[PDB]
Amino acid sequence: ESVLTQPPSASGTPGQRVTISCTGSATDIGSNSVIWYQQVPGKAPKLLIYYNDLLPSGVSDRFSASKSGTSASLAISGLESEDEADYYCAAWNDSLDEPGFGGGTKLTVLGQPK
Amino acid sequence: ESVLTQPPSASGTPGQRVTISCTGSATDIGSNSVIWYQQVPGKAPKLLIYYNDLLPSGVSDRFSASKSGTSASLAISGLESEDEADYYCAAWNDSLDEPGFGGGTKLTVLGQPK
């Protein structure tokens, strides 16, 4: 965190298209490729997006991403209960000489049984 | 596959340090960053290494990697039963204008109960 800015929380109902933003600067997002991943802390990340907008193998086509200037966005179409997780953005930062990270966005899916 | 070459199979006993090679060319490994991931086909990849030799969050320090010229290597120190999986290498290929992949290496850990 703190290099990239992500909202702390995001929520939606089943079937909605929800977007998660990630904002940076010329030295990170502006010049280098963005990655998106889901992670439970202390476990290896599940990669969702690489090279700004490409889907790796095995990832659902409900996911998409874009990058414009110093901002990046992750879109989830057809929100499903299984989508509840913590989402992070990352990119190489020329100022750090290593990767920079967002703080993570907890996505909550409403309308599930209690 | 076929852009990058990986051995199809790898095996070891508990506690061994095992290496997995990935060979390419000037247009992929030679010029661009290598990623390593584990994957069950049809599921999102678990990212192990990014930017040739860096460990993402949550990944065990038993894992390490290196890149030299057009070849890359993944090392697993202290081989454990949980390490049995399919391992892939990837890198952006300037000739393809998109990522190139290895064929995957099935790692088998010996000495477990039948």
Bridge-based pairing of strands B85-93 and B105-109 is antiparallel
Of A45, A44, A42, A48, residue with least CA distance to A62: A48
Listed residue (A103, A18, A27, A20) closest to A70, CA to CA? A27
- φ, ψ dihedrals at A106, nearest 5°: -85, 120
A24 and A30 Cβ atoms separated by less than 8 Å = yes
SS3 assignment, position A96? coil
C-alpha to C-alpha distance for A56 and B10, rounded to whole angstroms: 24
The hierarchical CATH code for the domain B1-114 is 2.60.40.10
- Domain borders along chain A are 1-114
Residue B52 touches partner A, C-beta closer than 8 Å: no
Question: Looking at the complex, does the CB of residue B55 fall below 8 Å from at least one CB of chain A?
Answer: no
Residues 25-44 of A with CB under 8 A from B: 35, 37-44
- Residues in B closer than 8 angstroms to A57, CB to CB, are 39, 41, 45
Q: CA of A55, closest CA in chain B: separation in Å?
A: 10
Q: Which of A42, A47, A99 sits opposite B45 (nearest CB)?
A: A47
